[PDB]
């Protein structure tokens, strides 16, 4: 859900490419622009996952963690 | 488009018609080159 968005601008000009062909010059910006995009989904992606991962350490840690509110508290600090 | 289209097939022609005068031009000046060398070995000959 959270790449939804920029997924879509990845289809969206792999639809517009589906359209060009290689008679047009328009290729050549057209492959400046693919470049860009899918280089940003990649990293926005793989920022995700390091951040996702750590979510799911620390909701982990709760089912472990002392039952005292300051523990607790402290987890729901790293969380949000 | 159609322009873009158009404009990128001119280039397109533009280049390849470019290289084919360049071959000419190499080979032409390749016959030159040759013919004065046998221009040379004819006169040596004359002088032998």
Redesign the interface.
Request: glycine residues 4%.
């Given at each position: 859900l959270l790449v939804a968005g920029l997924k879509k601008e990845v289809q969206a000009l792999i639809a517009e490419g589906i359209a060009l062909?290689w008679?047009?010059?328009?290729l050549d910006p057209y492959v400046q622009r693919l470049a860009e995009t899918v280089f940003n989904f990649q990293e926005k992606v793989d920022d995700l996952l390091i951040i996702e991962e750590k979510i799911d350490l620390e909701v982990r840690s709760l089912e472990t963690c002392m039952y005292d509110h300051k523990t607790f508290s402290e987890i729901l600090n790293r969380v949000q | 488009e159609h322009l873009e289209q158009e404009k990128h097939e001119l280039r397109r022609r533009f280049e390849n018609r470019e290289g084919e005068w360049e071959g000419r031009v190499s080979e032409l000046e390749t016959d030159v080159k040759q013919l004065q060398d046998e221009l040379e070995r004819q006169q040596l000959h004359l002088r032998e």
């Amino acid at each position: 859900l959270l790449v939804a968005g920029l997924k879509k601008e990845v289809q969206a000009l792999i639809a517009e490419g589906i359209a060009l062909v290689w008679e047009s010059y328009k290729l050549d910006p057209y492959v400046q622009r693919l470049a860009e995009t899918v280089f940003n989904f990649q990293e926005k992606v793989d920022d995700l996952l390091i951040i996702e991962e750590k979510i799911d350490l620390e909701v982990r840690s709760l089912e472990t963690c002392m039952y005292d509110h300051k523990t607790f508290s402290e987890i729901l600090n790293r969380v949000q | 488009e159609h322009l873009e289209q158009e404009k990128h097939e001119l280039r397109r022609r533009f280049e390849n018609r470019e290289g084919e005068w360049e071959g000419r031009v190499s080979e032409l000046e390749t016959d030159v080159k040759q013919l004065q060398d046998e221009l040379e070995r004819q006169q040596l000959h004359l002088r032998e």
